[PDB]
Design a protein around this ligand. Structure first.
Ligand code: FAD
Ligand code: NFU
Ligand code: NFU
Ligand code: SF4
Ligand code: SF4
Ligand code: SF4
Ligand code: SF4
Lengths: 240, 282, 392, 392
């Protein structure tokens, strides 16, 4: 009932996707109290006054139940690394919200050379440093898939969240997962659902097999998540 | 722990050719070894790190002495000297190739030789592996802030940079000199150097640097037989002035000090990374 | 005297820090607002990549306004390659950038609402905000292909065309948005003009005053001929901060004709609607007034648009490897510039970006001076700062 | 009902007079500020002389800003003969003008310091302006050939080029000047904004207000396409003074589009940096802010300059004997215009000059109205008037 939005090396796009549950946002903010989110709330303020300084700091509170962590971790920035360990220390459930936190995403391409922080060049998904409990791919994951995660987390629907808890153990995604796991292993039937999931239109169906345009893939993991020949839990088979 | 790795002998030396001394960083050992192989048929090509008018580095395969003299001097920024090693024995057609690199680059060359998966015809043609001492390195933009913003000198007006006396130095085309305390440069260093366990380029045929020897002289460790034969041909030909490191000051103790300070520090960083789950080489 | 440091500042996008030299009474004497977000370094890893990959990557600068960077990127590459997008592709591109801003401005009014909107009006206010944002995000989805990071913004124009039916229900969604915007205006304008927060605190009259100019090339889109980039110069943080704070900044210091310049809604209203009011409240007022001109412009684009017109240029993406292309776009927060050099093979030789909030950061540093430090964050939020943008 | 006449007014260049009709309380009802310096009549003895002589002679208008007249003179002759100076000759000429303004602004702050700089700060203050003037005069001597009256400013470009060494020595001198300028600016701006003199006298808030526009063509150099000379009309003193004072004036009354117009730092800052503050204090502030613009621009010229490039055009100095050439330059004290008609032999058939302070004189006459007469000279000094220029 206490949720927190941690923002590391991201773009806030995942947070905006959460905001794009307009009607369900007012239904979620009554069932859960938000306790930390720099972009939304002034928590948690502590002032320290000496004879020569007045320090007004906003730190992550304790007793966070669910923590939506967005963005990767910069290994050359002390604050970025302090906040990923601090979020893990103070949250019972941490969720790798988006490809940046889950698998690196676009930040995998970072290599520095750019001032004004010429030393900043190493960016890793949060899973490489802390244990993560759930992972949500996509750049960004849809508002629909987000509502589903939050609903299942509050209702204890472990069966639904299993596919994301399993993802939390792998911190590497790519467009080539479709080839190495589905095409090369004689599983791809050619439905094309992966091409329809891609946010950069990097997948193109040729000869009934997905062709990845490698210079357009941002490694968001949406296509491998969708492939029903990789993961097809039996819960999907129940309809009405 | 071992300070300098294995070596045969340690001396203080400088080049005999006075021209070389006018352009080199310290004693001119790297340029003097390169010019001697080239002129006496022990090397037909040498790998160097060149600079442009703004101090930006470019690894290059040289084949003339003038190419060697232009590349003389230290550029305290990252330059991938090994990226041209296959080019050197391919289109350039070298067979007695000279290699220079910081310790990490010398390690990459030994790895290259032991497991030459993508290095057909390359290991057998490496005639002299020269390593230069190194404590830290910098991205170009990192050094640019240090020179232009902390020392107040434009890149295009830099004639020579030197690190020494807890100070970083910038010498200008127009006679000016500026030095800052070495602790103002730390935040700008390549962080991957914080796991480096090699200060004296312990895996080279010959290693050279400025610490331990006075200005204009280089402390040089001779390590392998290949480097021993080369060096001995040089002194016999009068290419070098040699004084035993036991007489010149400050001396070998300063090398040992720094070499162990680097190893003790970066050792902690390796264990720190292992602790929080980050990969290290093994 | 004393030092005050507010870190991190809240209810805007990103991660920043205030460092204020204050006197014994609380008034700020020297101000320093700066980004401490880690630098991802987009422009530097775009070198070597094909030109088509630029609008995809630079979209991930920021998820609040991804459209603005995709637009500036393709405008910059088109300029380097001398490509002209067709009439209807351009109309669709501007409509996409408008749809983004139609959601950004109500979003910012939601971010600052804890200071200005009373608790009893809080619920109806947020519902009106989300109602306006829904429309805006609908437009970006329909034209751009996705709401957050639009893949249809491509070098040459726009990838796809809408249908006559989409254009219809978009027009009538814009009429709804216009009705909600008048509702929102008649509510916030009087609160900004009153100068007082919802807790009764009256703000100083000269809060947020500064002595810098404005940059704005267009009221709704962008016009690269209204600026001379040769006169845009980026200096280092050491030019505006002290030494110990300057080595903390993650951004550069953009100048025009040698001076810092403000960008954003007030910069545009000053260059197109003779709006010359100074201070932090005037900034908020301009941003509210602009919501009206955005939706009116969109409805005009829909009447002019031909939904069967060509939207992608056939001209090839090739460059001479020298010409420094220029692409500008008035993002929600202001002037936004990308630069691109393309070689004969269609690949990126050089890339650079001067983002809107990057202009505004050093301006905010001076604007917080003169007033009590417990008002500094109110000035900061008036500029709708987006740091992931300013840092990229 | 009383007249107050202050003759001569002090701490500025030249010989002038104030004639104020005041009420019984000291408030100025009608104001008159007019030069009474004898007219040397340069423009009239130039007719018949070769064109090369013009920048030599007009430079002796004034020793504070001689670069401003040589520049406008050559620029006007070049316009009449269709001469185009080379890239690096044009860069050197602007750099020479910036060096002159780099000495003039600090000099003026020295002239007004008896009112605004406290006594205990006076020695330190003068040492700062003399060090700043040293750098400025170095630049003019290096590029123009002489510090005062620069013979290298010639028809066709600039006569001599600098070396790679002096270019480097100038750049690092400019860095020092930028350091002193920030020191000076942080010092003076708080005083000008306080509105009080060093003896404790608080000045009126609306001191120096008037209702006239501005003219400015460029922030650091000049642009003849930003003005339509046909709209500039010189009237006689009888149009702005009463008969008995008008017959004393040594200067013509310039107007643009039918009205008086202000020139100078505030004019430029209004046209390029959106600075719209009225009053005398705002004039001082704008001038102080401009010092940074000047030295930043100088450093940019040094980076662009090619010391080996051509500096003089080979084109001949020949004219049709009818075209009215136009040369404009933003002198320290404002927009400065020269006109010339050159014949086929290269000789001057017609010459005219409308100097900066000439524009400001009739504006000053009106700006001193409304306030007590013991403040009129403070309004006058804010305009940094140069009378020997205004009269020529
Ligand atoms: C980043 C860096 C850090 C160093 N730190 C130390 C130190 O802490 N203590 C110490 O004693 N010595 C250090 N050195 C080496 C030292 O400064 C001299 O370079 C060394 O003594 C060789 O100089 P020389 O006069 O003998 O040969 P020279 O005649 O001066 O020739 C120098 C050779 O070095 C090569 N070179 C220059 N820059 C680079 C580069 N960035 N990467 C690879 N090769 C390059 C050139 O190709 C050239 O052939 C460092 C060098 C570098 C590049
Ligand atoms: N609006 C906006 Fe961005 Ni998130 C900023 N600042 C960029 O183009
Ligand atoms: N500045 C100046 Fe002059 Ni001495 C005036 N007024 C000229 O162009
Ligand atoms: S995953 Fe994509 S949308 Fe989410 S923060 Fe990263 S770049 Fe932005
Ligand atoms: S979703 Fe899986 S099975 Fe379907 S086409 Fe793509 S790779 Fe093949
Ligand atoms: S191909 Fe598309 S969906 Fe798959 S990882 Fe790449 S960007 Fe994501
Ligand atoms: S410190 Fe080590 S890793 Fe870094 S440049 Fe020197 S030898 Fe290479």
């Amino acid at each position: 009932v206490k949720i927190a939005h941690i923002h590391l090396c991201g773009c806030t796009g995942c947070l905006i996707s959460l905001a794009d549950t307009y009607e369900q946002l007012l239904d979620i903010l009554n069932s859960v109290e938000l306790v930390y989110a720099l972009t939304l709330v002034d928590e948690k303020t502590e002032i320290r006054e000496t004879d020569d300084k007045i320090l007004i700091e906003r730190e992550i509170p304790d007793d966070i139940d669910i923590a939506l962590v967005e963005g990767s971790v910069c290994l050359e920035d002390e604050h970025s690394m302090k906040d990923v360990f601090d979020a893990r220390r103070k949250s019972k459930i941490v969720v790798a919200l988006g490809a940046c936190a889950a698998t690196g995403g676009i930040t995998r391409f970072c290599r520095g050379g750019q001032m004004s922080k010429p030393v900043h060049s190493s960016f890793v998904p949060i899973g490489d440093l802390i244990k993560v409990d759930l992972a949500l791919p996509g750049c960004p994951p849809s508002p629909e898939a987000l509502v589903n995660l939050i609903t299942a987390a509050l209702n204890g629907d472990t069966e639904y969240l299993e596919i994301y808890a399993e993802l939390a153990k792998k911190t590497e995604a790519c467009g080539c997962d479709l080839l190495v796991n589905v095409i090369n292993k004689s599983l791809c039937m050619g439905c094309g659902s992966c091409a329809a999931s891609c946010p950069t239109r990097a997948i193109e169906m040729i000869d009934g097999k997905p062709n990845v345009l490698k210079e357009l893939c941002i490694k968001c993991g949406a296509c491998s998540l969708q492939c029903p020949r990789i993961r097809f839990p039996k819960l999907i088979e129940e309809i009405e | 722990m071992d300070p300098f790795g294995k070596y045969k002998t340690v001396v203080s030396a400088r080049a005999a050719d006075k021209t070389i001394l006018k352009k080199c960083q310290d004693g001119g050992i790297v340029s003097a070894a390169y010019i001697y192989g080239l002129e006496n048929g022990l090397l037909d090509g040498v790998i160097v790190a060149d600079k442009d008018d703004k101090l930006q580095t470019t690894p290059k395969v040289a084949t003339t002495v003038d190419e060697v003299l232009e590349a003389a001097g230290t550029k305290y920024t990252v330059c991938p000297t090994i990226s041209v090693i296959k080019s050197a024995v391919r289109e350039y057609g070298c067979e007695k190739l000279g290699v220079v690199g910081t310790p990490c680059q010398i390690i990459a060359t030994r790895k290259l030789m032991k497991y030459p998966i993508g290095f057909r015809h390359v290991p057998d043609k490496l005639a002299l592996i020269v390593g230069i001492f190194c404590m830290e390195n910098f991205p170009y933009n990192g050094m640019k802030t240090i020179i232009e913003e902390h020392c107040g000198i434009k890149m295009e007006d830099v004639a020579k940079t030197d690190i020494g006396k807890g100070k970083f130095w910038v010498y200008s085309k127009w006679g000016d000199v500026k030095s800052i305390k070495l602790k103002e440069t730390h935040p700008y260093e390549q962080q991957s150097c914080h796991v480096c366990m090699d200060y004296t380029a312990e895996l080279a045929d010959i290693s050279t640097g400025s610490v331990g020897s006075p200005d204009g002289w280089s402390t040089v460790f001779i390590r392998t037989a290949q480097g021993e034969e080369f060096f001995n041909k040089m002194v016999e030909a009068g290419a070098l002035e040699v004084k035993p490191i036991e007489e010149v000051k400050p001396g070998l103790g300063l090398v040992e000090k720094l070499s162990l300070t680097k190893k003790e520090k970066n050792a902690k960083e390796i264990e720190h990374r292992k602790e929080i789950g980050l990969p290290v080489p093994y | 005297g004393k030092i005050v440091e507010i870190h991190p500042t809240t209810r805007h996008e990103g991660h920043t820090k205030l460092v204020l030299k204050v006197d014994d009474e609380g008034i700020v004497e020297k101000g320093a607002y700066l980004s401490v977000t880690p630098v991802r370094g987009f422009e530097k890893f775009l070198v070597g990549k094909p030109a088509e990959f630029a609008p995809i990557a630079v979209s991930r600068f920021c998820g609040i306004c991804p459209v603005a960077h995709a637009t500036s990127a393709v405008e910059a590459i088109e300029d380097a390659c001398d490509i002209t997008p067709p009439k209807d592709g351009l109309l669709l591109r501007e409509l996409c950038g408008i749809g983004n801003k139609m959601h950004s401005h109500p979003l910012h009014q939601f971010l600052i609402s804890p200071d200005y909107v009373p608790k009893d009006d809080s619920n109806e206010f947020i519902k009106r905000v989300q109602a306006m944002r829904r429309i805006g995000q609908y437009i970006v989805d329909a034209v751009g292909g996705e709401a957050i990071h639009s893949p249809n913004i491509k070098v040459g124009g726009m990838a796809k065309q809408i249908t006559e039916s989409t254009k219809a229900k978009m027009y009538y969604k814009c009429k709804e948005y216009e009705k909600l915007a008048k509702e929102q205006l008649e509510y916030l304008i009087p609160i900004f003009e009153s100068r007082t927060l919802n807790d009764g605190t009256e703000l100083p009259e000269k809060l947020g005053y500064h002595d810098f100019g404005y940059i704005a090339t267009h009221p709704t889109y962008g016009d690269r001929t209204k600026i001379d980039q040769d006169k845009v110069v980026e200096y280092t943080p050491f030019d505006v901060y002290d030494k110990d704070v300057a080595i903390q900044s993650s951004t550069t210091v953009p100048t025009y004709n040698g001076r810092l310049m403000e960008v954003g809604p007030r910069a545009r209203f000053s260059k197109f609607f003779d709006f010359k009011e100074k201070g932090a409240m005037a900034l908020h007022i301009a941003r509210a007034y602009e919501i009206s001109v955005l939706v009116k412009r969109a409805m005009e684009i829909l009447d002019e648009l031909n939904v069967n017109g060509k939207t992608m240029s056939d001209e090839p993406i090739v460059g001479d490897g020298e010409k420094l292309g220029l692409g500008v776009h008035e993002a929600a927060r202001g002037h936004n510039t990308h630069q691109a050099v393309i070689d004969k093979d269609g690949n990126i030789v050089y890339y650079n970006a001067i983002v809107a909030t990057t202009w505004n950061i050093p301006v905010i540093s001076k604007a917080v001076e003169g007033t009590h430090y417990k008002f500094a964050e109110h000035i900061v939020r008036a500029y709708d700062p987006c740091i992931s943008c300013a840092t990229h």
